Design a protein around this nucleic acid. Structure first.
Lengths: 401, 356
DNA sequence: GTTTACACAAAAATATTTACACTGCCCAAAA
DNA sequence: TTTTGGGCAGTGTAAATATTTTTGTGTAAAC
């Protein structure tokens, strides 16, 4: 795609700017960008005033141009200086480079993508100064990433699908400066798999876990747009969620989250060197029926009563909520006990917010979490394996859906 | 002021007509799509100009940016993406290596810079070895020699590599230091093994100095667990806060009796080396603090870890030296601040070594 | 006669700096 | 022995803060 006219243009620009090396070529690149912008601005001024430099007009020329004024631009190649013309009454408006605009490059989206990757504002400042030439302070990075706040509000009011077969609820704790004191806030991510087998984060909510109805409030938000029943929801049983869903979504079959149970009870305080009893814990959720699952749970409890005893106690306490997991098919069971669909989420946030220790205000935390969630969900075009079969099993197990 | 010529006016007009330029981004992408391959070919021809210091080739702006990205530990795909986004052409890993090869005369000048005659304190530290390849693999180790001089500025003096415990390697290091201009070292701290005794007694022996403190703690707590290192940290904190040397001996015997059943073979070495560690307590509290701070060593180790993760790609015969030099200069650029309460330390050093 | 360039300030838009209010993370240590 | 404090090193960003650009208008030079 090399046009001979482009070749002649290259030869002419090499001849006019006297390019003899690569350094000369880059200097001439900067000079050529500046000259082109200045020429276009002079053409725009000629179009605005309606006459060229020093040319008479029959009608009384209402306003005279009165020289140039300097301005330094921030471009992709580097920092360039140009001279822009000016009208006496200051009526002319530049088109390519508008008034007071010096960051003509399109680095905004790149800065936002770097901040979503987990880079600090000062890290981004140093990186941009090193690999671009011009300076962008940390507060400038903050004001640039503030531009997606209407996007955040539209994502919070984003219209969701009608039916969601499987839902997961996860919690991630951070520190937040509220009312002048730094306390602690837990952010709850509501992820869901749709009818086609595609998982996509549907909700992100700031916790404020002082009251229980706030939890219910989240469901009410779903009641605002997710008006259909959820065939299965998987949440870490905490803070009186049972009453919330049973009064909001009573049709939903509420089971204890298997992977959250594994994370919270058998591994919160676990012997690090021999964590590999999940291979036997698989024996619990690879059982055909719930009675065999209870028997294998008793067996592994007998196996693990030598270590700290409080591990298997939670299984005995919550088996009443864990029992509906066995009614599902093996392909359905797979979706339950796969911690990789949950851990990979949490760890991802952990690997994104590794450098952000304390978030000033709720909205900064919300910005960072929305950016991380978008960066993660961008690659989530893969559908679920053996889906459609799962849809048939769902419609058989739930005849009215 | 830029007075433009009518021929350049026609050039700009033809450019705008060819690329249909209406906004600034249109102009930038037009310049990219027009000059990408041109810049690529010019760069490859200018780097292959020798085979296609006395003669040090000049560096370009884009080459300086590539050097900066090389120092930041960026992946080859990532720097390729950045260059494609800015200038509009691809850079292969071999091109990256050929571009980075241009800072070698700078490394020569940095390794041959004239030094002062007397340096109060000198440390030599070792880090892990990402072995270079010219047909062999090595058991050798990377050493950085950093010294604090009569004033209060810290600066890395040398970067060396060798057989790691031959007396000849240490002797060559000290002889290079003496050739660069050094004539007497007041305090030297090296990794305690063979060879350094003879190297000191044959290279810089105004007085014997085997004062090793930060080297001993790391050498003894390397073969222990980080979970217990905090308890080891508390016990060694009790060990280095002793006012007298005999109190330090008592604390050492106590911690050895406490830890000889969980890790018997480590602290034994300490006892075996206690004859050498004794003169450390002769210093005042300030000299002790300046010695065992190790914060600069930890910063250097973190930079070298960022280099070992991402920069060990090409032959380290020049690449390892480039990476270490870039990390050291990145530290020393903003590492020019003077030292804390250096005047009292200087008085104590001048009274402690009076015949200077 | 006109037209534009240039030079001073003052206003306005923008981007840098300071200041949090902490979190981690080492120690120098007391009860 | 475990619990305090005390620097240091980070963070995102509100609020003073400095900087750069644009403007008002008066001249000096140019067409």
């Amino acid at each position: 795609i090399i046009t001979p006219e482009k070749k002649e243009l290259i030869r002419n620009l090499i001849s006019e700017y006297n390019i003899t090396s690569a350094k000369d070529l880059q200097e001439a690149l900067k000079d050529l960008l500046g000259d082109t912008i200045q020429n276009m601005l002079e053409a725009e001024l000629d179009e605005h005033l309606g006459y060229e430099k020093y040319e008479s007009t029959e009608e009384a020329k209402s306003n005279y141009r009165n020289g140039y004024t300097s301005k330094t631009l921030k471009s992709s190649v580097g920092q360039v200086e140009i001279d822009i013309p000016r009208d006496r009454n200051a009526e002319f408006e530049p088109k390519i480079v508008p008034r007071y605009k010096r960051d003509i490059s399109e680095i905004e989206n790149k800065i936002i993508a770097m901040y979503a990757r987990g880079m600090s504002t000062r890290e981004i400042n140093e990186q941009i100064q090193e690999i671009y030439g011009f300076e962008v302070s940390a507060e400038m990075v903050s004001k640039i990433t503030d531009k997606i706040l209407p996007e955040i509000e539209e994502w919070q009011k984003r219209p969701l699908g009608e039916v969601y077969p499987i839902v997961f609820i996860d919690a991630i704790h951070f520190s937040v400066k509220n009312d002048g004191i730094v306390g602690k806030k837990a952010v709850y991510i509501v992820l869901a798999i749709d009818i086609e087998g595609q998982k996509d984060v549907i909700g992100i909510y700031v916790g404020e876990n002082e009251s229980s109805k706030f939890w219910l409030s989240v469901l009410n938000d779903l009641k605002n747009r997710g008006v259909k029943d959820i065939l299965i929801l998987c949440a870490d049983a905490l803070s009186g969620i049972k009453d919330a869903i049973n009064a909001a979504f009573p049709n939903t079959e509420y089971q204890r989250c298997i992977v959250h149970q594994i994370r919270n009870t058998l591994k919160y305080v676990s012997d690090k060197d021999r964590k590999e009893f999940a291979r036997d814990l698989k024996r619990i959720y690879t059982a055909p029926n719930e009675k065999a699952g209870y028997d294998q749970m008793l067996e592994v409890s007998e196996k693990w009563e030598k270590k700290y005893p409080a591990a298997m106690k939670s299984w005995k306490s919550n088996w009443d909520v864990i029992c509906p997991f066995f009614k599902y098919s093996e392909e359905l069971r797979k979706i339950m006990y796969t911690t990789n669909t949950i851990e990979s989420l949490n760890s991802s946030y952990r690997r994104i917010n590794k450098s952000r220790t304390v978030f000033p205000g709720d909205q900064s935390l919300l910005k960072s979490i929305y950016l991380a969630t978008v960066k993660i969900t961008s690659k989530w075009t893969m559908r679920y394996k053996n889906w459609g079969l799962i849809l048939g099993q769902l419609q058989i197990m739930f005849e009215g859906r």
